[PDB]
Amino acid sequence: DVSFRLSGADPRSYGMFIKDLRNALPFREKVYNIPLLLPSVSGAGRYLLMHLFNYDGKTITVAVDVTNVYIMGYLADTTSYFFNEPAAELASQYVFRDARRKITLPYSGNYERLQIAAGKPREKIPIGLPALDSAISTLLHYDSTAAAGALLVLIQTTAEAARFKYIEQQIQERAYRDEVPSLATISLENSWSGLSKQIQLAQGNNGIFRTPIVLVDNKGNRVQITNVTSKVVTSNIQLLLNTRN
Numbered sequence: 577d578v579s580f581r582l583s584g585a586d587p588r589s590y591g592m593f594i595k596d597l598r599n600a601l602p603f604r605e606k607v608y609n610i611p612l613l614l615p616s617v618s619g620a621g622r623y624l625l626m627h628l629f630n631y632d633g634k635t636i637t638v639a640v641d642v643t644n645v646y647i648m649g650y651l652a653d654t655t656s657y658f659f660n661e662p663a664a665e666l667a668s669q670y671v672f673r674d675a676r677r678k679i680t681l682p683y684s685g686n687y688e689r690l691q692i693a694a695g696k697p698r699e700k701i702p703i704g705l706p707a708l709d710s711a712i713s714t715l716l717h718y719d720s721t722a723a724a725g726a727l728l729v730l731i732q733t734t735a736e737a738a739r740f741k742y743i744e745q746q747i748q749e750r751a752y753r754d755e756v757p758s759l760a761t762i763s764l765e766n767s768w769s770g771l772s773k774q775i776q777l778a779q780g781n782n783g784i785f786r787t788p789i790v791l792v793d794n795k796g797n798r799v800q801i802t803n804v805t806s807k808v809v810t811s812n813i814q815l816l817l818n819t820r821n
């Protein structure tokens with residue numbers, strides 16, 4: 577398992593938590609020095625448990641698919657909550673068995689459906705470590721509309737930060753003050769499957785992307801990524817989704 581405590585949190589402890597979340601994900605090889613996530617894991621081993629504690633020491637346990645860093649559901653006290661999608665239904669066969677009751681949220685866990693339920697796109701929702709405290713508090717007792725926003729904060733401050741050094745650094749800048757995500761934060765979130773695919777294909781194409789990927793850079797400018805010498809590949813991306821997925 578992995579754990580993060582908001583009480584006493586600073587940019588250093590959060591960065592060490594995200595390094596620890598990355599290291600909890602199994603891999604057999606690296607492609608251009610980046611861990612390649614597994615094509616599949618059978619049974620309970622598919623799910624990492626992530627314990628998160630708010631400023632006040634109250635806690636949820638978050639179930640994460642280690643093949644794709646997808647958040648499936650979470651346990652709050654005696655009640656488990658899972659997204660309304662088949663992968664989270666399957667997760668609920670393996671995690672949070674002792675929960676007194678299991679709520680299926682009235683949305684899947686993808687951004688389009690969470691944004692509809694929250695009533696706001698990601699662009700308009702402040703993220704940071706305070707926002708993560710607020711998200712944990714929200715999730716401890718059920719409120720489906722409030723939960724969708726909290727889950728958007730949770731996904732971006734854990735899974736997205738695991739996938740990209742830049743996003744980890746953005747949340748470190750927000751350790752004490754929430755701010756809406758940068759243009760580049762949104763671009764990288766949207767681009768992870770695409771970048772993962774192109775970096776795998778570049779092995780067998782001399783480090784050249786079969787299809788260039790358009791991103792927004794840290795200056796807010798559109799850039800075309802064509803090969804593995806790009807800073808997005810040499811420093812930013814931290815995990816590759818397996819092309820099988």
Ligand SMILES: Nc1ncnc2c1ncn2[C@@H]1O[C@H](COP(=O)(O)O)[C@@H](O)[C@H]1O
Nearest residue numbers: 645646647685686687688731735765766
């Ligand atoms: N439950 C989730 N857990 C982890 N990452 C998610 C989750 N939901 C959405 N994402 C991320 O958001 C993107 C969903 O597709 P899209 O809305 O088209 O950008 C993916 O790239 C995910 O990395």
Ligand SMILES: *[C@@H]1O[C@H](CO)[C@@H](O)[C@H](O)[C@H]1NC(C)=O
Nearest residue numbers: 800801802803804805806807
């Ligand atoms: C490869 O990417 C680097 C860094 O982004 C860039 O300077 C270079 O022009 C690219 N090479 C080709 C042939 O596109």
